[PDB]
Scaffold this active site. Structure first.
Site, PDB file in Angstrom:
ATOM      1  N   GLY A  44      -4.695   5.111 -11.400  1.00 41.82           N
ATOM      2  CA  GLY A  44      -3.908   6.225 -10.865  1.00 41.82           C
ATOM      3  C   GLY A  44      -3.089   5.901  -9.629  1.00 41.82           C
ATOM      4  O   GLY A  44      -3.145   4.788  -9.103  1.00 41.82           O
ATOM      5  N   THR A  45      -2.332   6.892  -9.158  1.00 45.33           N
ATOM      6  CA  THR A  45      -1.466   6.729  -7.987  1.00 45.33           C
ATOM      7  C   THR A  45      -2.298   6.658  -6.708  1.00 45.33           C
ATOM      8  O   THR A  45      -3.479   7.002  -6.703  1.00 45.33           O
ATOM      9  CB  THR A  45      -0.433   7.875  -7.849  1.00 45.33           C
ATOM     10  N   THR A  46      -1.669   6.214  -5.624  1.00 44.06           N
ATOM     11  CA  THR A  46      -2.360   6.041  -4.346  1.00 44.06           C
ATOM     12  C   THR A  46      -2.492   7.375  -3.603  1.00 44.06           C
ATOM     13  O   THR A  46      -1.581   8.203  -3.622  1.00 44.06           O
ATOM     14  CB  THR A  46      -1.627   5.022  -3.443  1.00 44.06           C
ATOM     15  N   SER A  96      -7.168  10.708  -6.940  1.00 45.86           N
ATOM     16  CA  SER A  96      -6.457   9.729  -7.760  1.00 45.86           C
ATOM     17  C   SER A  96      -7.209   9.516  -9.068  1.00 45.86           C
ATOM     18  O   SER A  96      -8.440   9.452  -9.074  1.00 45.86           O
ATOM     19  CB  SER A  96      -6.352   8.394  -7.024  1.00 45.86           C
TER      20      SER A  96
END
Ligand SMILES: *[C@@](C)(CO)[C@](*)(O)[C@H](Cc1ccccc1)NC(=O)[C@H](Cc1ccc(OC)cc1)NC(=O)[C@H](C)NC(=O)CN1CCOCC1
Lengths: 212, 235, 243, 231, 231, 222, 240, 244
Positions: free
Chosen positions: C29-31, C74
């Protein structure tokens, strides 16, 4: 109310008044108290109006489902018992229903079943149900024979409702007539007591208690 | 083993797709819609000559204005019909009117996907629901166990379906009479049926606005069969 | 073997492979980050702009619990939302019975026990999110990070997602260089920088910055989003640092 | 089936040209005993609504919590919680109205009479009543308990119908409310001198006034009264 | 492979294969397009038929006077979810006298689809939805995926060959966003967008399906001779 | 002991014409001897050219109208935007009311609109679901005052043809919208005079094939 | 509660559990039904590997559902009791509500419906039983014979057989049974039934059960000697 | 989920057999042999204990023969624990019938109900069947003396003489040879013991490895008595018939 139905030589006569009451307030004069369940079945209403109207309509749905499932019109006995078993489940809750399930089938012939809200279910030839049942009984019983003609039987039923409509304060409006034969039920018109009384009084010479 | 409500890598429910194979094994059922009425016909397919063919009930009444023909595991249809009949009469009780053919079909199709780990498996039967109402007139629906339904001008289901569907594609036009549609069902049934078509191993039915849903007698169908053979020989 | 096919099954190591597999979804996932400050906490997240067709500022990922707790995560976004919905029920029942708003450590265990419960049975799947959350209570500021296993600890700074290591390194420098403490307004500016620096690990699609904060002085102990002039000021500070 | 214990008396309110006014005294009666004197019965929801509650105070405090919790719930996943998607008076009312009727229908009512006063987002004045039975109605002037009998007559002399609302200023409207509160103090045996008043204007916003007192009272004529007839 | 037996299982790389297989059912579905301006939001849907004798599967469903969606994938699953949205939209009306925000509509769908992906026995939904609506913050367009992920967009498209329409809208973004106070032109832009996903077949009278919602326009669907204008 | 019912007073009236139908009701709302509102409407447009009023206990009245309005909404969703006919709406309302047979809605309900032949229609209900189509009905507190007046003026009851020795009745005929509104206004002014729970204002909702129009008239405020 | 979907579809569109239930029926002892002009006869096989049996008390193969309807079966014996019990209860319930005994078609439809329900209910397997339901409707002299099976399908038969080696006896009946002219008398109908069983059974001693049902609740079971007379008569005519 | 670990106890084999029922019968075939013989004037129940140890308390023991009521008894073959669950259910059912009708329960009715319970475990519930076979010996005033048997399938049948458990094939042949209809109880006692003595896997049949019982009308005038044989009584009857 006042409703009756009787068996005779030429089938079944069914007659009802058309008044609705809320105490001494006359709620309606044009109410239909005969439910046409199918071309061979009739149901009369007396007692609580919504109770009768709702559950007899509901009865009609159960009779329709029977003939769909069984590919055969429901018997008068079975139809009456569906309704009597239903109200028995509500016994004590306060339902008020005085009904008569009238119809013809091949296996039974002309048949009338009395069903009421405390669970009583009775087969019989003559019944009168409602607040003015006693008044109808008086005229019907004293003039009844099995060998009555279709013409005389129709009139006797009409005249019996008229009698009760007059005396009973909680009955009146108009008379709805029906005749049930082997071929099915036949409607014999709405008869307003407004006109019917004076027509009967004059022609029959009866009702001498009233100022003519 | 594996879950009942599992997806395949192609994005289809295994159990629904397998139930469709069961329907292909079933006896043929054909429906054709016209402006004069909708016709429903089926192949009875008796497994033995001792079996009394008149007891084979594959065409069924739901209401006076809605009929139903089936194909596949026909035992599974009993509860579907029971629900359909209850829905139709129940709507009549609540609303004092006939129920729309589309609404009835949608009600039946809601049962379809109510399975998993509710019932244990999909239905193994397809239905052709034919009827009439005041809004959209004469209608023919095909209800599957996927929960999906398509309206059709004409449709064949069962073992001889793909062969019969191609035949219906050519023959159907928007000005077909009822008599024409009756013969067309008989014609196409006789083509795809294994045994020779007669009044005992095939059954016809129709739904019209005037007379409602009617299953034909064996005497009436026999004359339509005889009328069909004569017309084909006449050119 | 087959020890990784079912959840709640111990491997011969003493490990629950299904949970470790859930961690892989989180890493994908994204930060997202969290910074504890003098009198509060700051949260930030990386929103990947997949297309021009995405409406800016209108796909909000940071979520508020009660009125004083901020949550960001995330991994599987839906799993995160489910967890916050539980958090909101837990915080509501606490306030219903005990009057006072739920303390952050108390709230942290409520999520911790719930996530841990999803490692006890094979009939449920572990959560596919690491959740950074915190806020201000009677005992001051608290920052927490919760993982698929149910494991959580208190943090000075926290980071998770595809650019977690980059962000962790940058967070460690702030802890060393500011032993006496970091201010709330400073932490917002730093949070912007760290997301921009962590974006180097996800630089195909360009991104949208989103920041929120709780501070006893600045936001009066309540959770608010950073918007308008203060947001643009933090973006400009971040832009100046990368170049 | 309940019986109310600690109770609050009249809540009065009216509309004026730019908004609405609402008021209620700070007393919590325990039958004839005037038990609690520091009770606030006007509860603001956001910066555009005030809910005035009479009847059982335990039930009032339950409703307080429900409203407090409603603001929290509305803020969840709502970037426009302080703007376009803020809680409107009409939303707050309908919620309570729903609750009140559901509770009466379970034979376990919240023993209250409620008046929701506020201003909508389009500038329209909102004023509507609801009680333990779930009965709802709206009018240029609304009042509960003794207010219904004594306040409304006075307030209806200022705003008798809809067309009188634009013609009524905030100065005139507040004067009528403060007067009505004095009359209630003269004549309601379960009322107090101390009260709170709230104004929700479409321009100036929410003004909440606390620790007000009934003043300019006429008592001097009492000295001339003697006996009960002869004497 | 070994990790796709049910939704309760993760793969070694952290994937949910049953959710991904459900996503595959959408790609098989017929194309549908969504786009909006500041005043109106439009859905355009290519309907599919079994054969020439069959009807064309209806793609667009109405949820409220101000909200509805188009579907791509398993139609029964769209019926279940749209029914849920109808109830939630309706709950918002009856209880709070409030039209359900399009953003909340999305949040609710997300949380419903999620529960199906975390429990044994159940399955993910096998359909994708494009929700359009006009609420207190103007026009909106949402893209729902059965993974749970909901996304607000200016324009988008889902189904088979949806990449053609999606690229067109990505180019046309600046043009169609400013089509304010003009329904027919916004539809034309949507009909031109869906045309980029066509192969061999073209848009006919009983093939095309259009729906629109806006400032002074309730959610209405156009089929049959009513869409002949846009061919 | 808690009493879940109340009486909010007022009165309503429905009349049907050849190609139209009206449903009127005063705007006064009361409890005991106090006026709650001088203008609180209780006659509502429910869609599909159906107007409805449920007079008596306003909480039960509002709840019922709210449920029927909702019933119309779900009828469209479930049956392809089909128009709910007045007869179907009536039967649906029966089930709503009878659904609470043993804890009733304390209301006399009246709906009005057009039947499927385009002719004017008025249906009326008791509190537990009993219903009947009529040309004429008054409901609520002052029903007992207004109803007999309607029998005389709408259905020409007790009126005979002059000089026919009370043998020939006055023939039945439809009334124009102008004549009907005259009877409505007179019915309510008369009821306002003699019933304390009736007054303030009169709101009439007229239903034709074109749609639903409104008309308002002042009533005595004492 | 145990939920597992035991009856499920397979790639080729078959429900194996239902088909395997048919195999249990094929294993069961033979049962035959033949209907005449004014009667129906139910014949049943009894395997002779069991000596030292007590025939007084041993459960009989043909079971009365009501005074006018009977049910024989082939397959799992334990399973058959559950169907018979449910059928007997429904028979009394019908008399209670409709005030009329069940038709043979209705009773069959009910039993078939139960069997079907066990093919798509969770946690249950299908009935390993096929039945022959025979009798006369109330106030009706037309003979009725029906057959059910595990899948839930049912149908009416002029004559039919089920169980082990049923395909042999069905072959016999298909040529020996004339639709235009069924067995005119009771003797003729019983003889044809016994003849059909003698193609499969082994010996005509205590291996064959016969039950004759006639109109108006007239049901009787034949004894050993009575059946043995048919066996003796058929064998003497055979030697020709 | 948990599907992975489900044995699916209530399914059919491709041949149309119930796996678990068949395997349960295989289990019962290793249990100690139990025999029932019905005479004109009574019934005999005989059973062989499973490999006895010399330190086993024999007199205060019950493994094979159990009393359901005053008129009905059962011989067990299979898992004892399983049988006792079923026996207590049967004991209760008999008391329910007596409580309802004020009459002792007919033997077939009790047997049917207990067999119906076993059937249930083979069709639904997902549980293993009871690994038990019963021989019911009882009397009522309708059919007089009766012998039944039930097995894990839930199927029951009536018998003049019958064996269950181990070596039934050999035992049933021997019973079929020497049994006749005009037999007395004392003769049936002798037959029961002679059959066990020939079918036994043990070296010699002794008193300590047997349970024995009779149901006679040997009480005073028109009434039934149940006799569960004591260790010494088995020792005497074993000498009297000349086996030891
Ligand atoms: C004669 C006129 C005496 O009433 C008849 O019984 C008549 C029958 C009838 C049938 C169908 C349609 C209309 C009328 N009955 C009535 O008019 C009936 C009398 C009655 C009222 C209440 C009762 O309590 C159970 C029993 C009988 N009138 C009504 O039902 C009136 C119109 N409705 C109500 O009073 C409403 N109540 C009913 C009870 O529940 C509370 C609300």
């Amino acid at each position: 109310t006042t409703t009756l139905a009787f068996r005779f030589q030429g089938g079944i006569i069914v007659a009802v008044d058309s008044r609705a009451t809320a105490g001494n307030w006359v709620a309606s004069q044009t109410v239909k108290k005969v439910i046409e369940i199918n071309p061979f079945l009739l149901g009369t209403t007396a007692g609580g109006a919504a109770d009768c109207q709702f559950w007899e309509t509901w009865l009609g749905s159960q009779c329709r489902l029977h003939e769909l499932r069984e590919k055969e019109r429901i018997s008068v006995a079975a139809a009456s018992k569906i309704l009597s078993n239903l109200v028995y489940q509500y016994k004590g809750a306060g339902l008020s229903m005085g009904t008569m399930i009238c119809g013809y089938t091949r296996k039974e012939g002309p048949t009338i079943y009395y069903v009421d809200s405390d669970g009583t279910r009775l087969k019989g030839d003559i019944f009168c149900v409602g607040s003015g049942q006693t008044f109808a009984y008086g005229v019907l019983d004293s003039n009844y024979k099995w060998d009555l003609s279709v013409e005389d039987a129709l009139y006797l039923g009409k005249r019996s409702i008229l009698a009760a409509a007059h005396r009973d304060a909680y009955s009146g409006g108009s008379v709805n007539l029906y005749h049930v034969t082997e071929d099915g039920w036949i409607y014999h018109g709405n008869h307003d007591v407004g006109e019917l009384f004076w027509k009967v009084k004059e022609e029959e010479g009866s009702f001498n208690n009233v100022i003519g | 083993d594996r879950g009942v409500s599992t997806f395949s890598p192609e994005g289809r429910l295994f159990q629904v797709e397998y139930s469709l194979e069961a329907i292909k094994l079933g006896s043929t059922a054909i429906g054709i819609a016209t402006k004069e009425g909708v016709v429903l016909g089926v192949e009875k397919r008796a497994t033995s000559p001792l079996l009394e063919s008149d007891s084979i009930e594959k065409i069924v009444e739901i209401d006076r204005h809605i009929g139903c023909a089936m194909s596949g595991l026909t035992a599974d249809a009993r509860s579907m019909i029971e629900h359909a009949r209850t829905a139709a009469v129940t709507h009549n009780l609540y609303y004092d009117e006939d129920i729309n053919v589309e609404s009835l079909t949608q009600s039946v199709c809601d049962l379809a996907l109510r399975f998993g780990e509710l019932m244990s498996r999909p239905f193994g039967v397809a239905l052709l629901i034919a009827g009439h109402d005041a809004d959209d007139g004469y209608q023919l629906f095909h209800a599957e166990p996927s929960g999906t339904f398509y309206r059709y001008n004409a449709k064949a289901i069962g073992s001889g379906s793909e062969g019969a569907q191609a035949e219906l594609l050519n023959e159907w036009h928007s000005s077909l009479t009822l008599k024409e549609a009756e013969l067309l069902v008989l014609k196409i049934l006789k083509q795809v049926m294994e045994e020779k078509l007669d009044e005992n191993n095939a059954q016809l039915s129709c739904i019209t606005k005037q007379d409602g849903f009617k299953i034909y007698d064996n005497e009436k169908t026999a004359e339509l069969i005889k009328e069909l053979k004569e017309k084909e020989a006449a050119e | 073997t087959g020890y990784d096919l079912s959840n709640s099954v111990f491997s011969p190591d003493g490990r629950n492979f299904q949970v470790e597999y859930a961690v892989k979804a989180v890493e994908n996932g994204t930060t997202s980050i969290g910074i504890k400050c003098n009198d509060g906490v700051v949260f930030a997240v990386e929103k990947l702009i997949t297309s021009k067709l995405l409406v800016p500022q209108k796909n909000v990922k940071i979520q508020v619990v009660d009125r004083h707790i901020g949550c960001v995560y995330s991994g599987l976004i839906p799993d995160g939302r489910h967890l916050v919905n539980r958090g909101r029920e837990e915080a509501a029942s606490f306030k219903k019975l005990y009057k006072t708003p739920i303390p952050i450590p108390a709230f942290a265990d409520r999520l911790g026990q719930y996530v841990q419960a999803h490692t006890l049975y094979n009939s449920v799947r572990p959560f596919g999110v690491s959740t950074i959350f915190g806020g201000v209570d009677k005992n001051g500021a608290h920052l927490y990070m919760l993982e698929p296993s149910g494991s959580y600890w208190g943090y000075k700074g926290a980071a998770t997602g595809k650019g977690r290591q980059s962000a962790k390194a940058e967070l460690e420098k702030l802890v060393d260089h500011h032993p006496e403490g970091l201010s709330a307004r400073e932490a917002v500016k730093q949070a912007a920088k760290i997301i921009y620096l962590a974006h180097e690990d996800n630089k195909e699609k360009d991104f949208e910055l989103e920041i929120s904060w709780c501070s006893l002085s600045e936001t009066n102990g309540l959770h608010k989003f950073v918007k308008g002039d203060l947001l643009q000021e933090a973006i400009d500070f971040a832009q100046k640092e990368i170049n | 089936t309940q019986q109310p214990i600690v109770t609050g008396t009249s809540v009065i309110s009216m509309k004026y040209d730019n908004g609405v006014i609402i008021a209620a005294d700070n007393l919590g009666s325990y039958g004839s005993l005037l038990r609690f004197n520091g009770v606030e019965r006007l509860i603001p929801v956001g910066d555009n609504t005030v809910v005035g509650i009479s009847g059982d105070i335990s039930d009032m405090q339950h409703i307080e919590r429900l409203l407090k919790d409603l603001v929290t719930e509305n803020a969840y996943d709502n970037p426009l919680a302080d703007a376009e998607e803020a809680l409107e008076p009409s939303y707050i009312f309908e919620y309570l109205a729903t609750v009140m009727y559901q509770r009466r229908s379970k034979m376990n009512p919240l023993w209250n009479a409620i008046i929701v006063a506020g201003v909508q987002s389009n500038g329209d004045q909102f004023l509507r009543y609801v009680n333990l039975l779930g009965v709802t109605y709206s009018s240029p002037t609304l009042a509960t308990g003794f207010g219904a009998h004594m306040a409304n007559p006075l307030l209806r002399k200022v705003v008798d119908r809809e067309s009188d609302i634009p013609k009524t200023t905030v100065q005139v409207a507040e004067e009528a409310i403060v007067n009505a509160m004095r009359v209630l103090y003269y004549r309601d045996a379960r009322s107090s001198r101390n009260f709170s008043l709230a104004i929700i204007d479409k321009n100036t916003g929410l003004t909440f006034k606390k620790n007000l007192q009934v003043e300019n009272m006429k008592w001097d004529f009492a000295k001339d009264i003697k006996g009960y007839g002869t004497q | 492979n070994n990790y796709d037996g049910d939704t309760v299982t993760f793969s070694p790389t952290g994937r949910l294969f049953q959710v991904e297989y459900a996503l595959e059912a959408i790609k098989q579905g017929s194309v549908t397009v969504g786009l909006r301006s500041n005043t109106h939001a439009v859905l355009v849907a290519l309907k599919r038929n079994a054969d020439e004798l069959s009807s064309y599967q209806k793609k667009i469903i109405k949820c409220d006077e101000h909200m509805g969606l188009s579907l791509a994938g398993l139609a029964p699953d769209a019926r279940v979810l749209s029914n849920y949205l109808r109830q939630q939209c309706n709950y918002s009306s009856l209880v709070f006298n409030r039209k359900l925000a399009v953003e909340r509509a999305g949040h609710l769908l997300c949380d419903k689809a999620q529960k199906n992906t975390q429990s044994y026995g159940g399955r993910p939904y096998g359909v994708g939805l494009l929700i359009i609506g006009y609420d207190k913050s103007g026009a909106h367009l949402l893209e729902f995926q059965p993974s749970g992920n909901v996304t607000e967009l200016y324009g988008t498209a889902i189904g088979a060959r949806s990449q053609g329409a999606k690229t067109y809208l990505e180019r046309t973004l600046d043009t169609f966003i400013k089509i304010d106070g003009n329904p027919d032109e916004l539809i034309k832009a949507g009909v031109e967008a869906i045309s980029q996903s066509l192969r061999d077949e073209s848009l006919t009278v009983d093939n095309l399906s259009i729906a629109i919602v806006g400032k002074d326009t309730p959610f209405t669907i156009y089929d049959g001779e009513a869409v002949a204008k846009y061919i | 002991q808690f009493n879940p019912y109340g009486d909010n007073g007022g009165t309503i009236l429905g009349i049907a014409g050849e190609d139209f139908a009206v449903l009127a009701g005063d705007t006064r709302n009361i409890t005991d001897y106090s006026i709650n509102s001088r203008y609180e409407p209780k006659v509502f447009d429910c869609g599909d050219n159906i107007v409805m009023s449920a007079n008596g206990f306003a909480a039960d009245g509002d709840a019922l109208v709210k449920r029927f309005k909702n019933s119309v909404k779900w009828y469209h969703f479930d049956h392809n935007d089909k128009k709910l006919s007045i007869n179907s709406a009536a039967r649906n309302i029966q089930h709503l009311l009878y659904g609470k047979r043993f804890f009733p809605y304390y209301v006399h309900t009246i709906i009005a609109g057009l039947d499927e032949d385009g002719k004017g229609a008025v249906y009326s209900f008791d509190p537990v679901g009993s219903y009947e189509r009529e040309q004429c009905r008054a409901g609520g507190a002052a029903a007992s005052l207004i109803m007999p007046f309607l029998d005389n003026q709408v259905n020409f009851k007790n009126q005979y043809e002059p000089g026919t020795n009370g043998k020939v009745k006055k023939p039945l005929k439809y009334l124009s919208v102008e004549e009907v509104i005259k009877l409505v206004r007179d019915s309510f002014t008369s009821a306002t005079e003699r019933h304390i729970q009736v007054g303030d204002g009169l709101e009439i909702l007229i239903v034709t094939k074109d749609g639903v129009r409104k008309e308002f008239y002042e009533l005595k405020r004492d | 509660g145990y939920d597992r979907a035991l009856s499920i579809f397979s790639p080729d569109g078959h429900i194996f559990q239902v088909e395997y239930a048919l195999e249990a029926v094929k294993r069961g002892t033979c049962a035959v039904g033949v209907k005449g002009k004014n009667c129906v006869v139910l014949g049943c096989e009894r395997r002779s590997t069991l000596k030292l049996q007590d025939t007084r008390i041993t459960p009989s193969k043909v079971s009365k559902i009501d005074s006018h309807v009977v049910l024989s079966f082939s397959g799992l014996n334990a399973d058959s009791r559950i169907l018979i019990e449910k059928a007997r209860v429904e028979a009394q319930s019908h008399r209670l509500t409709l005030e009329d005994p069940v038709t043979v078609e209705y009773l069959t439809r009910y039993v078939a419906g139960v069997q079907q329900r066990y093919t798509q209910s969770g946690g249950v397997r299908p009935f390993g039983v096929s039945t022959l339901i025979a009798g006369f409707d109330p106030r009706d002299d037309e003979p009725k014979l029906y057959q059910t099976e595990p899948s839930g399908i049912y149908s009416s038969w002029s004559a039919q057989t089920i169980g082990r080696n049923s395909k042999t006896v069905r072959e016999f009946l298909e040529k020996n049974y004339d639709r235009k002219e069924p067995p005119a008398t009771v003797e003729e109908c019983v003889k044809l039934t016994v003849r059909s069983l003698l193609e499969v059974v082994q010996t005509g001693a205590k291996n064959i059960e016969i039950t004759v049902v006639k109109p108006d609740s007239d049901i009787v079971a034949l004894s050993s000697e009575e059946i043995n007379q048919y066996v003796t008569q058929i064998e003497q005519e055979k030697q020709e | 989920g948990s599907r992975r670990y489900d044995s699916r106890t209530t399914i059919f084999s491709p041949e149309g057999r119930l796996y678990q029922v068949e395997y349960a019968l295989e289990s019962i075939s290793h249990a100690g042999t139990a025999i029932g013989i019905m005479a004109s004037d009574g019934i005999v129940l005989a059973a062989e204990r499973k490999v006895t140890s010399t330190l086993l308390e024999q007199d205060t023991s019950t493994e094979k023969l159990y009393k359901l009521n005053d008129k009905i008894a059962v011989a067990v073959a299979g898992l004892t624990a399983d049988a006792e669950i079923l026996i207590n259910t049967a004991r209760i059912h008999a008391q329910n019938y007596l409580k309802t009708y004020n009459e002792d329960i007919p033997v077939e009715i009790l047997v049917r109900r207990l067999s119906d319970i076993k059937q249930g475990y083979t069709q639904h519930g997902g549980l293993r069947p009871f690994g038990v076979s019963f021989i019911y010996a009882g009397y009522d005033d309708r059919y007089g003396y009766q012998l039944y048997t039930s097995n894990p399938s839930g199927n029951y049948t009536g018998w003049k003489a019958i064996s269950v458990g181990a070596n039934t094939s050999a035992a049933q042949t021997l019973l079929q040879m020497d049994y006749k209809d005009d037999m007395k109880v004392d003769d049936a006692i002798e037959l029961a013991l002679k059959t066990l003595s020939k079918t036994t896997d043990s070296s010699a049949l002794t008193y300590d490895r047997l349970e024995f019982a009779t149901i006679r009308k040997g009480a005073n005038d028109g009434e039934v008595y149940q006799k569960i044989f004591k260790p010494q009584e088995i020792k005497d009857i074993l000498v009297k018939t000349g086996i030891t």
